[PDB]
């Protein structure tokens, strides 16, 4: 494939998300850099349409696993980079416990020298005083394990993991992610063995940004295959 070679250095990132949760339409745009060699992301996001109707933590997952650190002994198992530059489709269904669900379709691909994540999100069955639409999720994030599997019959991959958003009053809002990635181009891709990614994240605020924004620092690395 040779698509992994497009990530040997720092890559500019562009994120564009048109969302719609219970008719509350909104748009997000993000920009920054990704460094696959060290699985690092340095991004800042903005709600281009004003106040974001849902908490920023819920969109972190939706808002480029191709920038995950795959060590040399796992090069064979990096589907994300293997589908580049044509890219891959990333579809998810995020079920929040005792609340509604997101549904996302992303086209992650290269447009020039920039890796662009263009997303379309739709949320339904959400409760106006729930943890999401009621803004009870704290502005932090947790470390998660992301379990990756080759597709049920050999075209792309599937990914499942449970996100855990902290709630102001102590409890936790789970979010079952049922992810499904498929390559856009017809070229060859790497179908990996079962493994996992170990994620880190830090949400913060630019003190000079008066808009609704999310400063994101994120470290990710694959693991689970050796020798």
């Amino acid at each position: 494939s040779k698509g992994e070679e497009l990530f040997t250095g720092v890559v500019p990132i562009l994120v564009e998300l048109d969302g719609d949760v219970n008719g509350h339409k909104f748009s997000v745009s993000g920009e920054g850099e990704g460094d696959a060699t060290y699985g690092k992301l340095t991004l800042k996001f903005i709600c281009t349409t004003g106040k974001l109707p849902v908490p920023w933590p819920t969109l972190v997952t939706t808002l480029v696993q191709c920038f995950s650190r795959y060590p040399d002994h796992m090069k064979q198992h990096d589907f994300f980079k293997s589908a580049m530059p044509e890219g891959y489709v990333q579809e998810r269904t995020i079920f929040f416990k005792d609340d509604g669900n997101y549904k996302t379709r992303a086209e992650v691909k290269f447009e020039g020298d920039t890796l662009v994540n263009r997303i379309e999100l739709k949320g339904i069955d959400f409760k106006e005083d729930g943890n999401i639409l009621g803004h009870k999720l704290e502005y932090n994030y947790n470390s998660h394990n992301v379990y990756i599997m080759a597709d049920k019959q050999k075209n792309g991959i599937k990914v499942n993991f449970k996100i855990r958003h902290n709630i102001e009053d102590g409890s936790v809002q789970l979010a079952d992610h049922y992810q499904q990635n498929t390559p856009i181009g017809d070229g060859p891709v790497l179908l990996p063995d079962n493994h996992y990614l170990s994620t880190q994240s830090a949400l913060s605020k630019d003190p000079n940004e008066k808009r609704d924004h999310m400063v994101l620092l994120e470290f990710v690395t694959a693991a689970g295959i050796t020798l």
Binding site: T42, N194, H195, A202, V215, F219, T221
Partner: protein, 286 residues
Amino acid sequence: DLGKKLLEAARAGQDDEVRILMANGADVNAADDVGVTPLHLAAQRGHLEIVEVLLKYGADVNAADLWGQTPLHLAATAGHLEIVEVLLKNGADVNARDNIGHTPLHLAAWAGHLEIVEVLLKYGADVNAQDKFGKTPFDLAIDNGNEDIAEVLQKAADVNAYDEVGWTPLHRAAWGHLELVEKLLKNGADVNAADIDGYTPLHLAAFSGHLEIVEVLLKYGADVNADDQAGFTPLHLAAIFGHLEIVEVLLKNGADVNAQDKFGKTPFDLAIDNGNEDIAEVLQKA
């Protein structure tokens, strides 16, 4: 226009323009939209002469971008040894924290940069520093396969230890480290430790498809029908991923064929949906 040109000169590596722009009224501490200063770009992109020039001109060695990163954080990650030494020589905070809480030592250990680790230790790096997810530079080295760094960090100075996602050494060993599993269990590792998602080492082993590890876990008392907050049992996982021998062993040790995941499927149903015709067949004799 000087700030943008100085940032672009320090980025491109053009020490020609840096001293020209500084001879003009260029602010050495210019910062872009994100808090990146000419010293960040010179440090990250391996431009030693520019680092020395900027620091000589009064560049803030400890300037922090929006993500809390300093030129030392970037130099330690990018693996630029001399730049790290110079930064440390000019008053760089050896234990500055990025937004995740990484110190330069974490990043060097994360990035597999031994000589950086040695330098940072020599300049006073806190080997016991934890990021905001509980990981020490050692743990980060471990999780990334940086053995020598882990060996150096441990030397710099609980088999049931558990990180912020509930993973114990047995969870990490379950991914194809048989001898490690045997040692940990022999030393008293809790064979039924459930992580944050409710997964036990037997879940991970069945998911990873390591027969030997599954057998050892079972002969050490592993709950073959584990399912607290997990949503599956090891028999479900083994049936999803076509691990026939795993299914044989799990059944032999009392796996429940009628167990239902949180979607209502039995291991038979999962084997049917995944085309595992053999597993479905022997699961039919129940």
